[PDB]
Amino acid sequence: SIGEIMGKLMQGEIGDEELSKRIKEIFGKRLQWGYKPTHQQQLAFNLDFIKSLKEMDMSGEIDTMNEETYELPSAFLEAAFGKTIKQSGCYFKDETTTIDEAEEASHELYCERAQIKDGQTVLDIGCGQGGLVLHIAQKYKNCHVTGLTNSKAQKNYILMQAEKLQLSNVDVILADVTKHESDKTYDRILVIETIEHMKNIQLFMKKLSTWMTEDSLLFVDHICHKTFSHHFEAIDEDDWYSGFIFPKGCVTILSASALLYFQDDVTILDHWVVNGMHMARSVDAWRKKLDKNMELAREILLPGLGSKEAVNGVITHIRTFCMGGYEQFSYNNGEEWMVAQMLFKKK
Amino acid sequence: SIGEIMGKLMQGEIGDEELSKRIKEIFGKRLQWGYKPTHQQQLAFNLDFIKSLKEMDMSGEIDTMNEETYELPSAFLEAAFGKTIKQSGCYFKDETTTIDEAEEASHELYCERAQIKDGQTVLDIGCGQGGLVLHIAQKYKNCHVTGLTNSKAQKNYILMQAEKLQLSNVDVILADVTKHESDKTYDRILVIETIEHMKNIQLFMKKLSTWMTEDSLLFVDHICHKTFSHHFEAIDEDDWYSGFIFPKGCVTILSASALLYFQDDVTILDHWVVNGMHMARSVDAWRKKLDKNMELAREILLPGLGSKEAVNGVITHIRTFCMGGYEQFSYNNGEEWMVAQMLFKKK
Ligand SMILES: COc1ccc2c(c1OC)C[N@+]1(C)CCc3cc4c(cc3[C@@H]1C2)OCO4
Ligand SMILES: COc1ccc2c(c1OC)C[N@+]1(C)CCc3cc4c(cc3[C@@H]1C2)OCO4
Ligand SMILES: Nc1ncnc2c1ncn2[C@@H]1O[C@H](CSCC[C@H](N)C(=O)O)[C@@H](O)[C@H]1O
Ligand SMILES: Nc1ncnc2c1ncn2[C@@H]1O[C@H](CSCC[C@H](N)C(=O)O)[C@@H](O)[C@H]1O
């Protein structure tokens, strides 16, 4: 029945209404799994999860997703995502806000909450296509901004964009952050929807703290559930969705509070969440834009992929990610899965 | 109308059913005040509260309550409370568990969760009548156990009990903890329902950390609400209850998570809550026992108080505390106000 559903899915035989319904149900089951009848039990559940993280490696399973997803061609990414190719929840002020506007508003929100000021050294960990790196570099000309990514395609895209934008204050480190060794410290460290690719947050935060001084601030933004934590993994044997979107071990969804338990080496200063309708609007805009540019996307992908079938596979994956993300983040008007943000200083 | 209600109350003219109803309503209004429509707003509210604490003195307003309540005669306290005169939520396994049994079960739970082991030095901050100090001293003969209290009556009670119980490993420091200076460190620091009498938790935790080594553990138990924090203060102009029970500035009710934001100098290891029906059962047992020993209580109090009217005042205060506490802690079957517990080590 799994192979059946997957079969129809790949062959575009599941209508959008049915697809949305199916994925919503899967998320409903995660909610039933995660909510406990008493706060006593809720904390026992959450603490068990947190403790389990401390017995893992720093890194999640990243190898496959890096090769398959994070090393996709920039030109395909341009046809699906907004102008700066942001791959993270964006911020929509108005009904009529476009994805390009929502990217910029999100960048501004991060600069505000991370207390970016001109002249600082800034490290963006898991910088993606570098929308935030480029935003900070252009807005704060005396900042030096470093992006760090384990993707060659991302690094190359950023450096080309910086050259086109006449920015002189940008560099990019190509590194697996879990393996990166350096004595360098930064005034500001930003981690936008990258920590989900880590497991042992204790070890990750420890390493980040060694790249901070007493003057530094660390800003983290992560997909969350407000109440409980879960790995982004099949809820049961009927769950065709979760393991299609991300490989096992790749992505953790921390609760909105989970990082409060990872203060061995940094100390919290502030804590927010952004309602999930912003993320819902983000994935919806991506889905609609991919649909609009569907023919173009297929043409871009066909060389490097080799077959119309393999192209349709990548497209189905991205589109289904958006359709499913819509149900996840819009659930109960954005009050289940959402985005958490925290500001820390070093011990 | 306030003076009216207070008038009838002091004159025993409010029946129990009406009293319970009135106080429940007051707690209902606190719930409406504290629950926000979105987690975004809930965190904004909670963070504002936490930030406000960092701009206060370490100590709450303790002077009046110390003189009026914490310096009451032990013999009166014996007639209202359980065998060890525990003044904190206790733990009831069974329908038929007595307050004396519930005190002991609570003491055992603290020893378990604080990881007490024979041979450790132990400091009990705000030790009350020393039930926990005496429990640890008797169960772990190689432990040295120090109680600390700002009450002369409490110190004197504990030292007499230790002498009667043939304990040689107990001492008591008479000190305001917010003023206590010492180079002494302890393997274990316990704070059972005392932190509610502090305000600036940042300064309080900082001081406790200076009394810890790398080997120490800090265990805190505090009355909480699961979701939000509040001062125990009049909700509005109709609230005759809150300011009758505690003086303004005396008692803070932290959320179940609030202490997670006070990790500048200590780091969390574990976190629990105990459902509020345990506290409800605790105050109910006190209320019933005071009622049973009402005539005796009045006789004990009459000397030091000087008038039957002033005696009735103290009795009304304690009884109303129990009646109101019942409504507070039993609200929604113990799933609103409850007891939070956390275990920390030093940075
Ligand atoms: C498909 O292009 C993406 C677009 C946006 C995001 C990701 C994408 O994939 C590469 C992945 N991030 C980075 C990791 C964490 C994460 C987990 C999610 C999510 C978005 C995320 C975030 C945001 O929706 C459910 O679960
Ligand atoms: C009346 O004898 C008492 C009996 C139990 C307790 C206290 C008593 O007073 C001295 C006060 N503590 C210590 C401080 C914190 C606190 C706050 C409370 C409470 C109990 C508490 C605790 C637990 O019920 C609503 O709010
Ligand atoms: N171990 C690792 N080391 C370095 N970068 C990593 C990594 N695991 C994942 N990444 C990167 O983390 C990012 C996650 S996607 C988020 C990208 C960007 N912050 C944005 O908001 O658009 C991608 O750049 C991915 O390449
Ligand atoms: N500033 C301060 N310094 C020292 N003790 C204080 C204090 N403020 C309050 N206390 C003490 O804190 C205790 C609160 S009542 C709890 C008593 C005991 N832990 C029990 O569980 O029964 C009382 O002993 C009170 O005297």
TrEMBL record, chains A, B:
GO terms for biological process: methylation. Gene3D superfamilies: Vaccinia Virus protein VP39 (3.40.50.150). This is Tetrahydroprotoberberine N-methyltransferase. S-adenosyl-L-methionine binds at Q87, S88, D176, V177. S-adenosyl-L-homocysteine binds at Q87, S88, N150, Q154, D176, V177. The keyword Ribosomal protein does not apply. One of its GO terms (molecular function) is (S)-tetrahydroprotoberberine N-methyltransferase activity. It is an enzyme of class 2 (transferase). It holds the Pfam family CMAS. Belongs to the CFA/CMAS family. It comes from the Eukaryota. InterPro entries: SAM-dependent_MTases_sf. Keywords: Methyltransferase, S-adenosyl-L-methionine, Transferase. Its EC number is 2.1.1.122.
